[PDB]
Amino acid sequence: LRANDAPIVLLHGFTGWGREEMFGFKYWGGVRGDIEQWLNDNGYRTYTLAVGPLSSNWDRACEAYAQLVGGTVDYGAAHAAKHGHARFGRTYPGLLPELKRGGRIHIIAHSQGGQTARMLVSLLENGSQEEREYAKAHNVSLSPLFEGGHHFVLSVTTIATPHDGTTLVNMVDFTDRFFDLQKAVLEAAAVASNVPYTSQVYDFKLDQWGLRRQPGESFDHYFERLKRSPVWTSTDTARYDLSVSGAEKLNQWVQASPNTYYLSFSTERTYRGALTGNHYPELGMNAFSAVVCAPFLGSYRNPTLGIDERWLENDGIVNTVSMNGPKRGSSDRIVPYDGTLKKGVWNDMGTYNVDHLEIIGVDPNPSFDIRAFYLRLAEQLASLQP
Ligand SMILES: [Ca+2]
Ligand SMILES: [Cl-]
Ligand code: NA
Ligand SMILES: [Zn+2]
């Protein structure tokens, strides 16, 4: 039974783009359809966010905040100074200015979207003491985001999120394989990587870094520059936050708010081998993961640095163990779902036999009823007591 009227907001991972980008092929639904549209049509009011795919969680959290309330992205004077990029990004009209007046949202996030969402809550609740002190000391203005004592997220749901990172980052030639993954996603959207499109197609939103695909430049050639740029080589990146190491550092300061419900969905798409119990990709796993990513994830161990057999089950991109909520460096509490959702803790909603891209429809999986999945989820979120 419906207990709240908060709209849902969709948030992508280290790939992702707006409803007008990719010629309208949806990150949220890919080849199966349009998930925002299903939810709207069933009376669950839903919006989509689009933030820097490769950018740091912090950056994406600041971009999400401006996209929601309205205004110019403000990364924080201290952060901008420390990392070497613009303080101010683009300007948004604001999807939900009512959040300034007591409105709230449910955030549904995929992949690294799940770190960004947790970071947005943490920033709203506590702000950033570093940003507050720096503003005072240098006599510059301060984004309300960094003050603290704000609240507008009623729930965060995460789907296949690397809360404790993914070992994929430790692969040899991770750099080249990761950009090949970006190319494989362009291909699923029927977009070539060797064509210098004059339309934008896929905006990496790297205003703060001063980076933009050039006239006459293809995605192949762009990515070769990106690989060599600060959005790939600095610690202020999705790359850094995605590693077991960065993820743990994030968990050190991004904690669960007592005022927000947390829901986690875990994914797996592998089988256990008969030799040493390595994991291998199942049939139907998206081809790029099955060939390039899954063998690595299902066999890479580091008994010193925590990584043992529990890490081998994966969804083709993320270790399944990483997904039920943050554990390394975290004091958040994770409880199995028991039929009542509780505020302030991770309600682990179970593991689904779906891969990283299938769960958002970017790869087909006809045995997966993705429409029922996301409708069932909208209905549980609509039942949450405010
Ligand atoms: Ca498939
Ligand atoms: Cl450039
Ligand atoms: Na992604
Ligand atoms: Zn930054």
Author numbering: 3 to 388
Provide excerpts from the study.
The X-ray structure of D311E lipase (2.1 Å) showed a typical α/β hydrolase canonical fold consisting of 11 β-strands and 13 α-helices. The Ser113, Asp317 and His358 were assigned as the catalytic triad. Compared to BTL2 lipase, this crystal lipase was solved in closed conformation at high resolution (2.1 Å) using in-house X-ray diffractometer. In D311E lipase, the ion pair network was composed of five amino acid residues (Arg 274, Thr 278, Gly 279, Arg 303 and Glu 311) connected by seven ion pairs. In D311E lipase, the distances from these ion pairs were between 2.5 Å and 5.2 Å. In contrast, the distances of ion pair involved in T1 lipase were longer than those in D311E lipase. The Glu 311 and Gly 279 were connected by one hydrogen bond and linked to each other at an α-helix and a band region. T1 lipase (circle), K344R lipase (triangle) and D311E lipase (square) showed different Tm, which were 68.52 °C, 68.54 °C and 70.59 °C, respectively. The t1/2 of D311E lipase at 60 °C and 70 °C was 110 min and up to 12 h, respectively. The improved stability of D311E lipase was due to additional inter-loop interactions, which were indicated by the atomic details of D311E lipase with the observed additional ion pair and hydrogen bond interactions.
